[PDB]
């Protein structure tokens, strides 16, 4: 605003831009550089020449192009209207930018508003009285952004506390219009429905709370083996094109949380495009009738074809957005595609800066950002009079080279994570269903998850430990069979191998393209594991009666085909038919016992 604090461009090589004659610019502060007035973030300072990191394309710029420092850190707009809106690395709307530039390409030095100032919404003062003392975090109003989620909270700006002075009446308004005025010791301050929050510091809450509420995965392996609760940190490391993007889409789809913040980093454009095409076609069938997946989520795009710093910037913006969603008193989640692109971006950054590399080209501050991003999310009571309990889950994809755990990504991820879900390329290469290693994937949140699953009086821990033991014993049995042969084992080990195969084909493997196996309910998987355990106990008891495993498997073909047919099933109705089918299975076992004698 005609302040004209400006340094001059000195050295320019690739994405890094060093600008001198500016001592006014701070560290991690926003600055408009070049002749195109491109947004950027200054990193270091040496003498009279401060090193600035550009988050955009530096191609075409020339020496002598002025750089204006704002002096303030990175910030994003928080409030209603950002939902179901695709923001770029500059946090500008993609549709609006493409329409304004009238080109499918990406320009350079472009400036556009986050939300729409011409956008109107119906905002109503939520039970708050004028003159009542208020502070930061309190809801000053409520607006309906979508047809499902209603009353998006307008939060009082940070570092503000006092008494309500002039709070305007409810009605239709925009994001640029002040809906309130608050009097304090700092005299007068204008308050709007939209509040600006720094991207460097996540939106604060009241106090950290223990998360005992399990978040529904929808998948058997994600809910049972390596569990992830609401606010829990679950890693999803995978190989290149191992279905990592697919697992991310499945996770953001079948999620039982309220909102979703998905920030793509260095991912393919066809994935986000397919996401944009299939978002609106899919609609929720739960409460809030007529509501799609697009309106219940927000998408941030940092392309692989985009700038390198755009990934870390969109990641931080997505973190601030998820923190604002967690401060909104709702359970949300962050879906990150290929965090390894941001890590490698950090590697090229520290590398171009002249700093010394250690492992995998990255700097030594990687662990700080990883641990900060992991401990940032969680379940905690938010600020404000509302006193709501918020939740934020962190889901980050790591793409190590060749799927090796020796990669810096895998280690740094596994270090700060309380839960990790691993992806295998063995069953993925065979075009088999979702691949997860039973000898690798584990969760430290599994205990409280067992305590939470006991609320439904399901047995998570028992079935999981029994199946894991059966899996390990069958794996050892596989090592022995591969060692000597299949004729060197006993009836019980063979039963363990057959049960392993049954658990492999009929349980862990579920077709996502199917009209049935695409989504598995809690009761469905619980009943399946229970019926499996019942058939296993019945077979183990029958083998102890002096019957061979093969002879037992001779008349058990019906129960086998029935156990393999539990994947299709039907809607919520007919669970009784399944449990009853299990009863018919035990009865069938009794009939077989009668048949044996004789």
């Amino acid at each position: 605003h005609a302040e004209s604090e400006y340094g001059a461009i000195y050295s320019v090589s690739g994405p890094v831009v060093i600008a001198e004659n500016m001592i006014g610019c701070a560290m991690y502060e926003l600055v408009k550089v070049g002749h195109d007035n491109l947004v950027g973030e200054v990193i270091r300072i040496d003498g009279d020449k401060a090193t600035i990191q550009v988050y955009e394309e530096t191609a075409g710029l020339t020496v002598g192009d002025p750089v204006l420092r704002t002096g303030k850190p990175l910030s994003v707009e928080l409030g209603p209207g950002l939902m179901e809106t695709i923001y770029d690395g500059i946090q500008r709307p993609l549709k609006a930018i493409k329409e304004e530039s009238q080109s499918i390409y990406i320009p350079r030095g472009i400036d556009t508003p986050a939300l729409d100032r011409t956008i109107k919404w119906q905002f109503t003062p939520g039970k708050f009285q004028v003159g009542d003392h208020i502070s930061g975090g309190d809801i000053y109003g409520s607006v309906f952004e979508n047809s499902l989620i209603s009353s998006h909270k307008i939060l009082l700006p940070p570092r503000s506390r006092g008494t309500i002075t002039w709070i305007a009446p409810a009605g239709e308004y925009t994001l640029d219009e002040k809906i309130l005025e608050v009097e304090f010791d700092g005299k007068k301050s204008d308050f709007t429905l939209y509040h600006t929050w720094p991207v460097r510091v996540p939106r604060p809450v009241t106090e950290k709370l223990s998360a005992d509420y399990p978040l529904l995965t929808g998948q058997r392996v994600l809910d049972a083996l390596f569990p992830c609760v609401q606010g829990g940190t679950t890693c999803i490391p995978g190989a290149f094109g191992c279905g990592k993007t697919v697992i991310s889409q499945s996770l953001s789809k079948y999620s039982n949380s309220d909102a979703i913040i998905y920030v793509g980093c260095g991912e393919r454009g066809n994935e986000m495009a397919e996401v944009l095409m299939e978002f609106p076609e899919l609609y929720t069938e739960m409460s809030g009738t007529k509501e799609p997946i697009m309106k219940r989520t927000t998408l941030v795009a940092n392309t692989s074809n985009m700038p390198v710093a755009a990934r870390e910037a969109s990641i931080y913006t997505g973190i601030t957005l998820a923190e604002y969603f967690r401060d909104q008193g709702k359970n949300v989640s962050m879906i990150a595609d290929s965090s390894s692109r941001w890590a490698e971006a950090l590697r090229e950054i520290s590398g171009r800066l002249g700093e010394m590399p250690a492992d995998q080209g990255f700097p030594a501050y990687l662990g700080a950002k990883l641990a900060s991003f992991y401990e940032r999310a969680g379940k905690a009571v938010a600020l404000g009079s509302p006193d709501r309990t918020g939740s934020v889950s962190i889901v980050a994809a790591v793409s190590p080279a060749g799927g090796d755990f020796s990669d810096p990504v895998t280690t740094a991820t596994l270090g700060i994570t309380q839960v990790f879900w691993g992806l295998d390329k063995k069953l993925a290469q065979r075009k088999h269903f979702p691949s997860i290693n039973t000898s690798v994937s584990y969760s430290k949140y599994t205990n409280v998850l067992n305590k939470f699953y006991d609320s439904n009086y399901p047995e998570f821990p028992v079935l999981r430990d029994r199946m894991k033991e059966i899996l390990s014993n069958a794996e050892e049995l596989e090592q022995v069979v591969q060692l000597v042969g299949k004729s060197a084992l006993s009836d019980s080990d063979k039963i363990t191998l057959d049960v392993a195969t049954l658990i492999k084909e009929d349980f862990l493997q579920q077709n996502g393209y199917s009209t049935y196996d695409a989504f598995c309910p809690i009761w469905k998987t619980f009943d399946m594991m229970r019926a499996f355990i019942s058939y296993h106990d019945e077979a183990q008891k029958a083998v102890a009666n002096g019957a061979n495993w093969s002879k037992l498997a001779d008349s058990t073909g019906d129960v086998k085909h029935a156990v393999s047919s539990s994947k299709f099933f039907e809607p919520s109705r007919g669970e009784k038919e399944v449990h009853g089918e299990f009863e018919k299975l035990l009865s069938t076992m009794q009939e077989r016992f009668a048949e044996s004698t004789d």
Partner: protein, 453 residues
């Protein structure tokens, strides 16, 4: 134009007495011997500037050299007259034709497609291959690579793809392609030339050829020229645009060469640290544009070092492009027709072209089931090779014969023989018919009752 030059070290250049230089700017270097070499600007600091020589700093005087700086960024003379005429890696005519009149002057760097402007992968195509149809589907406008080994029939199989492409695709207006080589062999150049001539598409296609005899800079710049050309064809020309790029291995090693020549801090396996993004430059350019006719379908070809699929080249290839079609040395020495590895090979979108309304509802499930029988056949092959022929189960021998038959019949069709997708589905239903009724657990009841004669 500044005639002042300061230092020279290795394959690079440094000049002084200049200001306001542009990043990756086109610069003309006139040497002391009268040699005119094209070059690009590296960095600019104060009154000093640093640039990289494409033709090399070999045989160049320090104070006797003159340089004319355009100041504009990387610029190419794109036109509509490129079809039927051949161009080199340096842009100069290798077809011994006259001067090509440029319709538009555009940056060869290429522009990233906006996400909202990005249209989802759709339709389908017939590559003439059962594996390019059944196992892993190929969408029109999508991007899929080909991973081969040194000495293997990469050029010949790719030739089969480019030759059978426009012929078979109509069965799902002839298809127009683009041939691109970066630091490639003379033998492979002759093979590709005879292939493009035999296809008769040489008139309807353009060729950018950078020989191995040529510099590395030209090889790295060939991909950019092909990117701008294919972009101009898939947008401005509004026609179906196939993108065929070869010798990615040479461009990679050359990239490592340029990265080391500047003594820059290298990443894993000695390559560049920006390699993900460097490959993503031309990799994410593929896709469809909403409202704009035509599309750019990327069909790249790379060679894994020492036939290692676990190599950083292939790993980065999978990390950049989405999905790949593998060529294994295991099946190449078996003597059967072109060696596609079922495990490693996968498609970007195999769910987009399947189902009713596209082709048939018998496609996808049969793909999953056939892949299952093949994998089970491989594991059973290992188990049979371990313990013995009498020590394996019934499913082991059945899947073994099924995989052997799938390899001898389904996998083996021909290079100049383009098998229609329908023939692929029929031969696949007949290959699956070899297996028992309880054999396929990935197949539905209806398809099982329908496929069996």
């Amino acid at each position: 134009n500044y005639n002042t030059v300061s230092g020279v070290n290795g394959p690079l250049v440094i000049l002084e007495k200049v200001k306001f230089p542009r990043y990756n700017e086109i610069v003309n270097l006139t040497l002391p011997d009268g040699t005119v070499r094209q070059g690009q600007v590296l960095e600019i600091r104060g009154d000093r500037a640093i640039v990289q020589v494409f033709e090399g700093t070999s045989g160049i005087d320090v104070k006797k050299t003159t340089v004319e700086f355009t100041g504009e960024s990387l610029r190419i003379p794109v036109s509509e007259d490129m079809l039927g005429r051949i161009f080199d890696g340096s842009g100069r005519p290798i077809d011994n034709g006259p001067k090509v009149f440029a319709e538009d002057y555009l940056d060869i760097n290429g522009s990233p497609i906006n996400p909202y402007a990005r249209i989802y992968p759709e339709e389908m195509i017939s590559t003439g291959v059962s594996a390019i149809d059944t196992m892993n589907s190929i969408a029109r406008g999508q991007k899929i690579p080909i991973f081969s080994a040194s000495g293997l029939p990469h050029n010949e199989i790719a030739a089969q793809i480019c030759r059978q492409a426009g012929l078979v695709r109509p069965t799902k207006e002839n298809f127009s392609i683009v041939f691109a080589a970066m630091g490639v062999n003379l033998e492979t150049a002759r093979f590709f030339k005879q292939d493009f001539e035999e296809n008769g598409s040489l008139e309807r296609t353009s060729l950018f050829l950078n020989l191995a005899n040529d510099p590395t800079i030209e090889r790295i710049i060939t991909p950019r020229l092909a990117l701008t050309t294919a972009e101009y064809l898939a947008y401005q020309t509004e026609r179906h645009v196939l993108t065929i790029l070869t010798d990615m291995s040479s461009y990679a090693d050359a990239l490592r060469e340029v990265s080391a020549a500047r003594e820059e801090v290298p990443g894993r396996r000695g390559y560049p640290g920006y390699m993900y993004t460097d490959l993503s430059t031309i990799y994410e350019r593929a896709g469809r544009v909403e409202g704009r006719n035509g599309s750019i379908t990327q069909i790249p070809i790379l060679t894994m070092p020492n036939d290692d699929i676990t190599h950083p080249i292939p790993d980065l290839t999978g990390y950049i492009t989405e999905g790949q079609i593998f060529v294994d040395r295991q099946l190449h020495n078996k003597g059967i027709y072109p060696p596609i590895n079922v495990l490693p090979s996968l498609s970007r979108l195999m769910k987009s072209a399947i189902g009713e309304g596209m082709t048939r509802k018998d496609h996808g499930d049969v793909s999953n089931q056939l892949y299952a029988k093949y994998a089970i056949g491989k594991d059973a092959a290992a188990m049979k090779a371990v313990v013995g022929e009498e020590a394996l189960s019934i499913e082991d021998k059945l899947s073994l014969e099924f995989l052997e038959k799938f390899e001898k019949t389904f996998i083996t069709q021909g290079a100049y023989e383009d098998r229609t997708v329908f023939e692929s589905l029929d031969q696949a239903w007949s290959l699956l018919r070899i297996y028992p009724k309880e054999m396929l657990n990935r197949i539905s009841p209806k398809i099982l009752d329908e496929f069996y004669d």
